[PDB]
């Protein structure tokens, strides 16, 4: 009854990104969100240099027309010192500094090398094949803006500018608990109507891999006072609080009354498959997210709702959510109009190099295995019905959380 | 002269995965290699349950074709161990223990409540909607092979089996350094032709994201005692050793004479671009990877060769040269036959949703132009020349390391 998208944006419009920052050495900023625009201390490149292996010339000399002896050679790591007489060129290598008074570089493959000179015949435009100081980064220039997530792509660039450390937004603190007598810890006899609690583990893993900082409170004892205390404990110390399962997502019970006691909190019936319900709202100093019980629904939910929430919340400017790709099926697909169906696919290249998807086999909520077997989602459109082979189809690869 | 593929093979063929293990609780197992086949000590599910919101029934009450009332309710965490008289039915919820002596579960889509009990508007057969115990997972069955890289797919399922912990292969330890009187750290100025030392940082970061223990000995001084000592220390405490640059990648100097003392090292001239020189070989107690000084080439060699080696060394049986898709160019591309060119570029949706690739622009070799402008590698065939707009081309999206997946 609610489009995933609508749900998402309401979530995101209520949410203010963290601002508390801390300064760290680059080596510790993997995954981390720039707190402040980084600015260049230096010009990149630092000095005018040769775009090619060729020869440094002055337009005057070219016009003269005669072959130009080589008076010297500038290299990557040794500029040409000393006399550069009219009538001569300087042999130059890609990257090497252009000598004092140089008007142009001529790629060697435009030239004839001879007894007593380099013979130039192509017109030479002033400035050709020189890279001018700062043309790739001027000093003073923003190089990565605040809100950039830091990666092997950025951090060495920053190191290259002589920068030892940068300010990043502080990790998001996220507290985690489940509740329910059914739930059992690994080790104990599986009791009567009892099962091993796996959602908490799942959510823990994804939180950490999302660069969050998890305060895992564990299974709360089947009791209002115990539960109430846990909400207080968590909202005192964290930005986000997640019920991984047990706490009502609409169904009336003491859990529900404690939520409506401690906060203003929605219960949404999302139009998706798998799963449906989701709780979200504001505790005193935290956002609350309650996942359904069922392992699949919980997972899909966390990954499609909570991930983004945290991403915005972290200070990250870009969507943390991977991008999607139009592609064809190598498999008939069942889909009922009504829900936004996230089914598992195998995205892989076919015989002719073409990328295609393949159903993983059975796709219920009573087996979890279609996250290992899968390597991507197949986001079939809400209204869209069944899907005969070779159809255009939206595909969303699994990020790191699953491999 | 030597093809990227050949070099890769030489390396891995020599290499022997770690078998040393440790056993950790599941929550500490992300990205970690399973040492031992995970064997299921119990059945999932653990007692025969129901598929649907319906009624546990029989075939000698349904033999009656009579309206049958409700004796009790079986629930998720409240299984029914109650009287269930002769002519009655048991309310059962989706997922719950089939109660003693039960034969089938009906929906309420085939059922209505009358004054005198629940009457059934469809056929009802033995096995219907009772999930067998252990039909998903049989007890004593292998769930996850030894060599699997544990992830958010595997760990909760293992947890579904009451297992708190698993054996994994210990992390690969990697020693890192660079050397040369050129190299300088942040903080300090630039002794005429000095430069800042990025390769090490770059590599240190990647290794960690690959789940290694990094032993980073910084920039070694340009002195044979410093350098030899660094090598000995390194080799003694690690499984791999990597000069991020400074060490000979083939040129005749005092680092080279050390390599040949301490190990059997080969100096390779790869048929690639950017770059060429690369060093691989066994030391006393570790493997040595020597990266060329040029940063763009150091980074490209690590990604394309060293990463795979670490994968192998790790235990991970997932044979892994990361994925590559055949896409159209939005850009002209300069390219010389004879070398396999890793150019960088920009994978992105066009109007129609089908992917395309633009060049970064290309100016100088530059960690900017290459990574952080590119979101992928445009990998061009060795035998190929120049590409105009809309030739087919191979592309290899950057991974986590460059913020890709």
Contact yes or no for A155/A220 (Cβ under 8 A):
no
Helices (H), B87-210: 155-160, 198-209
What are the residues whose beta carbons fall under 8 Å from the beta carbon of A314, sequence distance 6 or more?
A: A17, A18, A33, A169, A171, A172, A211, A320
Query: What phi and psi values does residue B218 have, to the nearest 5 degrees?
Result: 65, -150
Are A152 and B202 an interchain contact pair (Cβ–Cβ within 8 Å)? yes
User: How far is it, in rounded angstroms, from Cα B283 to Cα B241?
Assistant: 9
List, as one string, the DSSP characters of B250-298: SSSSHHHHHHHHHEEEEEEEBSEES--EEEEEEESSSEEEEPPSSHHHH
Residues of B in contact with A33 (CB under 8 A): none
CB-based contact (8 Å) between A321 and chain B?
no
Which two structure tokens, joined as six digits, stand for B147? 């060599």
Q: Cβ distance A146 to A35 under 8 Å?
A: yes
Query: Do B402 and B294 share a domain, yes or no?
Result: yes
CATH number, domain at B294? 3.40.980.10
Q: Residue A348: which domain range?
A: 323-396
For residue B265, say if its preceding peptide bond is cis, omega within 30 degrees of 0. Answer: no
* Beta-carbon contacts of residue B397 (< 8 Å; ≥ 6 apart): B322, B323, B325, B347, B375, B376, B377, B404, B405
Residues facing residue B76 across a β-bridge: none
Query: What stretches of A168-223 show up as alpha helix (H) in DSSP?
Result: 199-209
- In terms of Cα–Cα distance, which of B233, B237, B299 is closest to A157? B299
- A6: distance to nearest CA of chain B, Å? 23
Size of interface A-B (CB pairs under 8 A): 187
Do B226 and B341 fall within a single domain?
no
Q: Is B200 helix (H, G, I), strand (E, B) or coil?
A: helix
CA distance B13 to chain A (A): 25
Q: Chain centroid to CA B328: how far?
A: 28
User: How many angstroms separate the CA atoms of B121 and B131, rounded?
Assistant: 22
Q: Residue A245: left (phi > 0), alpha (psi -120 to 50), or beta?
A: left
Residue B306: helix, strand or coil by DSSP? helix
Q: CB under 8 Å to A331, separation ≥6 — which residues?
A: A357, A358, A359, A389
* Nearest beta carbon to residue B77 from set A194, A295, A323: A194
Same domain, A344 and A225: no
Name the domain count of chain B.
Answer: 4
Bridge partner residues of A220 (DSSP): A179
Residue B309 shares a structural domain with residue B175: yes
In eight-state DSSP terms, residue B18 is -
DSSP letters of B363-390? -SS-HHHHBTTBSEEEEE-TT---B-TT
Hunting for tokens 């990574």 — which residue is that?
B371
* Token digits of residue B166: 């698993």
Q: Same structural domain for residues A120 and A250?
A: no
Judge contact between A380 and A341, C-beta under 8 A: yes
Whether A12 and A308 have beta carbons less than 8 Å apart is answered as yes
The contacts of residue A343 (CB under 8 Å, 6+ apart) are A273, A333, A335, A359, A363, A377, A378, A380
B297 with B175, same domain?
Answer: yes
Residue of chain B whose Cα is closest to the Cα of A374: B153
For residue A145, give the CATH number of its domain: 3.90.105.10
Does one domain contain both B195 and B290?
yes
Query: Which residues 231-290 of chain A have a CB within 8 Å of chain B?
Result: none
Contact indicator for A397, A347 with CB cutoff of 8 Å: yes
Cβ(B84)–Cβ(B173) below 8 Å: no
- CA-to-CA distance for A42 and A133, rounded, in angstroms? 10
Instruction: Give the closest-approach CA distance of A401 to chain B in angstroms.
Output: 6
**Alpha-carbon distances, residue B190 vs A19, A133, B89, B194 (angstroms):** 35, 17, 86, 5
| Cβ-contact B194, B233 below 8 angstroms | no
**B352 touching A (Cβ < 8 Å):** yes
Whole-Å CA distances, A349 to A354, A375, B333, B368: 5, 13, 24, 30
Distance (Å, rounded) from C-alpha A151 to C-alpha B208? 12
To one decimal, the resolution in angstroms is 3.0
CA distance B196 to A156: 10
Q: Do B363 and A135 touch (CB under 8 A)?
A: yes
Tell me which chain B residues have a C-beta less than 8 angstroms from the C-beta of A93: none
The candidate with the shortest Cα–Cα distance to B220, out of B182, B258, B260, B267, is B182
The single residue listed with the structure tokens 């000590």 is B41
Question: What are phi and psi for residue A97, nearest 5 degrees?
Answer: -65, 140
Q: How far is CA B209 from CA A87, A209, B198, in A?
A: 56, 11, 17
Rounded CA separation A375/A402 (Å) = 8
Q: Which chain B residues are closer than 8 Å to A51 by Cβ?
A: 364
Please give the method by which this entry was determined: X-ray
Structure tokens at A363: 């796709």
Residues A371 and A253 in one domain: no
Q: Which of B95, B163, B201 sits opposite A26 (nearest CB)?
A: B201
**Nearest C-alpha neighbor of A272 from the set A343, A323, A328, A325:** A343
CB under 8 Å to B172, separation ≥6 — which residues? B18, B211, B212, B213, B239, B240, B310, B313, B314
For residue B157, the chain A residues in CB contact (below 8 A) are 198, 368-369, 372
Residue A13 to chain B, least CA–CA distance (Å): 25
And the tokens for A367?
Answer: 């087996």
Q: Nearest to residue A398, comparing CAs of A311, A325, A313?
A: A325
CB B359 within 8 A of CB B391: no
Q: Same domain, yes or no, for B227 and B309?
A: yes
Query: Given its phi and psi angles, is residue A188 left (phi above 0), alpha (psi -120 to 50 degrees) or beta?
Result: beta
Name the helix (H) or strand (E) containing A266: strand A264-269
Please count the helices (runs of H) and the strands (runs of E) in chain A: 8, 26
Whose CA is closest to A165, among A26, A326, A68? A26
Contact A135 B162 (CB under 8 A): no
Q: Read off φ and ψ for residue B404, nearest 5 degrees.
A: -80, -70
Q: Are B164 and A187 in contact (CB under 8 A)?
A: yes
The CATH number of residue B347's host domain is 2.40.340.10
Query: Which residue in this structure is represented by tokens 């017109």?
Result: A123
Going B346 to B351 to B353 to B356, the CA torsion angle's sign is negative
Instruction: Determine the residue among A148, A153, A320, A362 to mutate to test chain B binding: the one whose Cβ has the most chain B Cβ atoms within 10 Å.
Output: A153
**A367 and A275 co-located in one domain:** no
Interface test with A, best of B189, B217, B372 (most A CBs within 10 A): B372
In terms of domains, do A266 and A204 share one?
yes
Please, are residues B405 and B399 in contact by the beta-carbon 8 Å criterion?
yes
What is the token pair recorded at A323? 């991008």
How many alpha carbons lie under 13 Å from residue A275 in its C-beta half-sphere?
A: 28
Q: Does A323 touch chain B (CB under 8 A)?
A: yes
Helix (H, G, I), strand (E, B) or coil at B314: helix
End-to-end CA, chain B: 33
Tokens of B58: 């029989």
Say yes or no: A193 contacts chain B, CB-CB below 8 A.
yes
Which of A100, A91, A17, A12 lies closest to A56 in space, CA to CA?
A: A91
**Are B12 and B306 within 8 A, CB to CB?**
no
DSSP bridge pairs for B195: B183
Which CATH number covers residue A131?
2.170.190.11
Q: Do B403 and A153 touch (CB under 8 A)?
A: yes
Handedness of CA A384, A390, A395, A400 (dihedral sign): positive
- Structure tokens, B227: 């350098």
Kindly report whether the peptide bond that precedes residue A268 is cis, defined as omega within 30 degrees of 0. no
Kindly state the DSSP code that residue A149 receives in the 8-state scheme.
Answer: B
Same domain, B277 and B331: no
Which of B205, B207, B210, B356 is the mutation pick for testing A, counting most A CBs within 10 A?
A: B205
CA atoms within 13 A on the CB side of B46: 16
Q: What is the dihedral of CA A246, A252, A256, A258, to 10 degrees?
A: -120
Q: Match 């349950």 to its residue by tokens.
A: B49
Of A152, A165, A190, the CB nearest to B402: A152
């Amino acid at each position: 009854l609610m489009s995933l998208d609508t749900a998402l944006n309401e979530m995101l419009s209520r949410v203010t990104p963290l601002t508390a920052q801390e300064t760290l050495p680059l080596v510790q900023c993997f995954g981390r969100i720039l707190a402040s625009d980084v600015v260049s201390p230096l010009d990149v490149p630092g000095f005018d240099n040769s775009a090619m292996d060729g020869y440094a010339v002055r337009l005057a000399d070219i016009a003269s027309g005669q072959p130009l002896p080589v008076a010297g050679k500038s290299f990557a790591g040794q500029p040409y010192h000393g006399e550069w007489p009219a009538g001569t060129c300087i042999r130059i290598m890609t990257g090497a500094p252009v000598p004092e008074g140089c008007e142009a570089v001529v790629m060697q493959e435009q030239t004839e090398q001879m007894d007593n000179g380099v013979r130039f015949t192509a017109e030479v435009r002033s400035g050709q094949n020189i890279r001018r100081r700062g043309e790739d980064i001027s000093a003073g220039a923003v190089v990565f803006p605040a809100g950039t997530r830091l990666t092997t792509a950025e951090l060495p660039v920053i190191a290259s500018l002589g920068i030892a450390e940068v300010p990043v937004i502080r990790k998001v603190r996220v507290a985690l608990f489940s509740t329910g007598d059914e739930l059992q810890l690994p080790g104990q006899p599986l009791g009567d109507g009892q099962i091993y609690d796996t959602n908490r583990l799942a959510v823990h893993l994804m939180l950490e891999q999302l660069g969050c900082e998890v305060i895992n409170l564990g299974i709360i004892r089947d009791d209002p006072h115990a539960l109430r205390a846990a909400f207080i404990e968590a909202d005192s110390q964290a930005d986000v609080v997640i019920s991984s399962g047990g706490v009502s997502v609409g169904e009336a019970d003491y859990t529900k009354t404690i939520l409506e006691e401690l906060g203003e909190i929605a219960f949404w019936k999302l139009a998706i498959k798998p799963g449906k319900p989701f709780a979200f709202g504001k505790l005193s100093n935290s956002w609350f997210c309650g996942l359904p019980g069922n392992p699949v629904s919980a997972t899909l939910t966390f990954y499609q709702l909570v991930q983004p929430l945290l991403a915005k919340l972290s200070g990250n400017t870009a969507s943390g959510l991977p991008a999607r790709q139009r592609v064809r099926t190598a498999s008939r697909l069942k889909k009922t109009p009504g829900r936004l169906d996230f089914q598992a696919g195998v995205l892989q290249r076919n015989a002719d190099g073409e990328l295609e998807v393949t159903t993983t086999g059975h796709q219920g909520s009573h087996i979890f295995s279609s996250f290992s077997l899968g390597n991507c989602f197949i986001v079939l459109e809400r209204d869209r019905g069944n899907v005969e082979v070779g159809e255009w189809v939206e595909v969303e690869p699994f990020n790191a959380l699953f491999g």
